[PDB]
Scaffold this active site. Structure first.
Site, PDB file in Angstrom:
ATOM      1  N   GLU A  44      -4.085  -9.027  -2.249  1.00  0.00           N
ATOM      2  CA  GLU A  44      -4.853  -7.790  -2.201  1.00  0.00           C
ATOM      3  C   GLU A  44      -6.331  -8.141  -2.077  1.00  0.00           C
ATOM      4  O   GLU A  44      -6.754  -9.275  -2.330  1.00  0.00           O
ATOM      5  CB  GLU A  44      -4.601  -6.885  -3.418  1.00  0.00           C
ATOM      6  CG  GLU A  44      -4.650  -7.575  -4.779  1.00  0.00           C
ATOM      7  CD  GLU A  44      -4.087  -6.675  -5.900  1.00  0.00           C
ATOM      8  OE1 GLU A  44      -4.872  -6.011  -6.630  1.00  0.00           O
ATOM      9  OE2 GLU A  44      -2.847  -6.619  -6.033  1.00  0.00           O
ATOM     10  N   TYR A  72       1.565   3.167  -3.123  1.00  0.00           N
ATOM     11  CA  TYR A  72       0.567   4.058  -3.717  1.00  0.00           C
ATOM     12  C   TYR A  72       0.580   5.445  -3.104  1.00  0.00           C
ATOM     13  O   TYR A  72      -0.174   6.310  -3.569  1.00  0.00           O
ATOM     14  CB  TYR A  72      -0.843   3.445  -3.644  1.00  0.00           C
ATOM     15  CG  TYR A  72      -0.942   2.260  -4.563  1.00  0.00           C
ATOM     16  CD1 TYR A  72      -1.322   2.411  -5.888  1.00  0.00           C
ATOM     17  CD2 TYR A  72      -0.595   1.007  -4.123  1.00  0.00           C
ATOM     18  CE1 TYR A  72      -1.373   1.330  -6.736  1.00  0.00           C
ATOM     19  CE2 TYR A  72      -0.644  -0.074  -4.951  1.00  0.00           C
ATOM     20  CZ  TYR A  72      -1.033   0.086  -6.261  1.00  0.00           C
ATOM     21  OH  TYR A  72      -1.076  -1.026  -7.078  1.00  0.00           O
ATOM     22  N   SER A  89       0.818  -1.207   0.000  1.00  0.00           N
ATOM     23  CA  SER A  89       0.000   0.000   0.000  1.00  0.00           C
ATOM     24  C   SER A  89       0.855   1.261   0.000  1.00  0.00           C
ATOM     25  O   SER A  89       0.487   2.260  -0.632  1.00  0.00           O
ATOM     26  CB  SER A  89      -0.953  -0.020   1.196  1.00  0.00           C
ATOM     27  OG  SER A  89      -2.125  -0.754   0.878  1.00  0.00           O
TER      28      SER A  89
HETATM   29  N1  LIG Z   1      -4.060   1.950  -2.742  1.00  0.00           N
HETATM   30  C1  LIG Z   1      -3.709   0.733  -2.089  1.00  0.00           C
HETATM   31  O1  LIG Z   1      -3.369   0.703  -0.933  1.00  0.00           O
HETATM   32  C2  LIG Z   1      -3.711  -0.572  -2.932  1.00  0.00           C
HETATM   33  C3  LIG Z   1      -3.396  -1.762  -2.329  1.00  0.00           C
HETATM   34  C4  LIG Z   1      -3.347  -2.916  -3.097  1.00  0.00           C
HETATM   35  F1  LIG Z   1      -3.023  -4.061  -2.393  1.00  0.00           F
HETATM   36  C5  LIG Z   1      -3.634  -2.882  -4.499  1.00  0.00           C
HETATM   37  C6  LIG Z   1      -3.925  -1.648  -5.109  1.00  0.00           C
HETATM   38  N2  LIG Z   1      -4.236  -1.177  -6.248  1.00  0.00           N
HETATM   39  C7  LIG Z   1      -4.475   0.030  -6.391  1.00  0.00           C
HETATM   40  C8  LIG Z   1      -4.826   0.826  -7.675  1.00  0.00           C
HETATM   41  C9  LIG Z   1      -5.099   2.050  -7.698  1.00  0.00           C
HETATM   42  C10 LIG Z   1      -5.359   2.570  -9.038  1.00  0.00           C
HETATM   43  C11 LIG Z   1      -5.231   1.506 -10.016  1.00  0.00           C
HETATM   44  S1  LIG Z   1      -4.772  -0.079  -9.042  1.00  0.00           S
HETATM   45  C12 LIG Z   1      -5.382   1.499 -11.357  1.00  0.00           C
HETATM   46  N3  LIG Z   1      -5.387   2.701 -12.090  1.00  0.00           N
HETATM   47  C13 LIG Z   1      -6.151   3.774 -11.284  1.00  0.00           C
HETATM   48  C14 LIG Z   1      -5.728   3.849  -9.664  1.00  0.00           C
HETATM   49  N4  LIG Z   1      -4.318   0.585  -5.170  1.00  0.00           N
HETATM   50  C15 LIG Z   1      -3.954  -0.507  -4.296  1.00  0.00           C
END
Ligand SMILES: NC(=O)c1cc(F)cc2[nH]c(-c3cc4c(s3)CNCC4)nc12
Length: 343
Positions: free
Chosen positions: A321, A240, A237
């Site tokens: 996830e 991101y 996480s």
């Molecule tokens: N944020 C997280 O903590 C998180 C944690 C995970 F285990 C998998 C994830 N995936 C995503 C995505 C965000 C976006 C994506 S995938 C595609 N394009 C637009 C924005 N966030 C996570």
């Protein structure tokens, strides 16, 4: 002057920071004369999403380069960029559409923040005034509580290019989330999970909660379709947060997520409706937290066990996830301010 504790005041400062908003738009190479920070349109962003979806459709079929180029051009005509000496990059592949979509995601939340910040009406500190606009109660969790220790242990054990240090832990209660979440509290399999995002999104996240991509938006990059994504590994996480060694501080959420019966998948599958009796997707990773060290915190499972092999045969994912497709399945509990120590 403000009655709020110092860490809460600093949190307010960092999420409403206007320099960070303009810095983000400069790094995206947006023409700030043609599209100022103060003139961002939700309607303009909506149309841009659709152009990007049409671009992705063209790319997928195989289309005349003249068609791809006209679409690509329509986007930059709608969202004005200034690329300096370079020519605008041609939107003709998946990675390129995703980057521009993720930029629109970020711009929308920046618009929410700037709209909040500009709107409203003398006696109160602007820190307190802008605090209230988040519609979120924010308390500092004491370092010498079992709560903070459980949380800090969760960060240590599920961290597998940087070291992670927890600066502040805030307990949070968004207005309306208690009521919205209560039916889902009946589902079994409630878990405390990580969710990372850029700092410039946290005024939106706190006033509106975690949201699902609109239907205009491309699905490119969403391994399990448009939903709300969570990790049981703080590392997954924290990526991101998009934190730069320039400013090595990030914000990360702990959410109680009501998973129910998990639709367990090893490979990409764009979900549009779950099977009957399923309430979430679990992407199965090579590594999972040791289930023998699962502990509980207020009736919610915390999977802080150190990483062990899962034994999943043909997995595309290094780590698990979790995805839910209803915004009411998420109860945001904590907000961590993290220092990234790059090494
Ligand atoms: N944020 C997280 O903590 C998180 C944690 C995970 F285990 C998998 C994830 N995936 C995503 C995505 C965000 C976006 C994506 S995938 C595609 N394009 C637009 C924005 N966030 C996570």
């Amino acid at each position: 002057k403000s009655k709020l504790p110092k860490p809460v005041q600093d949190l307010i400062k960092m999420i409403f920071d206007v320099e960070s908003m303009k810095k983000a738009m400069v790094e995206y190479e947006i023409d700030l004369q043609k599209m100022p920070l103060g003139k961002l349109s939700k309607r303009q962003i909506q149309a841009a999403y659709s152009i990007l979806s049409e671009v992705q459709q063209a790319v997928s079929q195989g289309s005349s380069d003249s068609q791809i180029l006209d679409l690509s051009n329509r986007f930059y005509t709608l969202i004005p960029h200034d690329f300096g000496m370079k020519k605008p990059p041609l939107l003709n592949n998946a990675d390129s559409v995703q980057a521009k979509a993720e930029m629109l995601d970020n711009l929308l939340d920046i618009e929410v923040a700037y709209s909040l910040l500009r709107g409203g009406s003398s006696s109160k500190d602007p820190i307190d005034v802008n605090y209230e606009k988040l519609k979120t109660d924010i308390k500092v969790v004491d370092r010498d509580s079992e709560e903070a220790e459980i949380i800090r242990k969760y960060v240590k054990n599920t961290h597998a290019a940087y070291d992670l240090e927890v600066i502040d832990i805030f307990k949070i209660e968004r207005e309306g989330e208690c009521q919205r979440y209560k039916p889902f509290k009946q589902l079994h399999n409630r878990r405390l999970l990580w969710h990372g995002s850029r700092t410039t999104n946290f005024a939106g996240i706190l006033s509106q909660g975690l949201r699902i991509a609109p239907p205009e938006a491309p699905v490119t990059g969403y391994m399990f379709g448009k939903g709300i994504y969570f990790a049981d590994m703080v590392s997954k996480s924290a990526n991101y947060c998009h934190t730069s060694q320039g400013d090595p501080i990030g914000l990360i959420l702990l959410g109680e997520v009501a998973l129910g019966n998990m639709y367990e998948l090893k490979h990409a599958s764009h979900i549009s409706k779950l099977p009957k009796g399923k309430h979430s997707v679990k992407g199965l990773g090579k590594t999972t937290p040791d289930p023998s060290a699962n502990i509980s915190l207020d009736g919610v499972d915390v999977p802080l066990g150190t990483g062990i092999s899962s034994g999943v045969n043909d997995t595309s994912l290094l780590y698990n996830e979790y995805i839910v497709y209803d915004i009411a399945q998420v109860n945001l509990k904590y907000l961590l301010k993290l220092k990234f120590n790059f090494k």
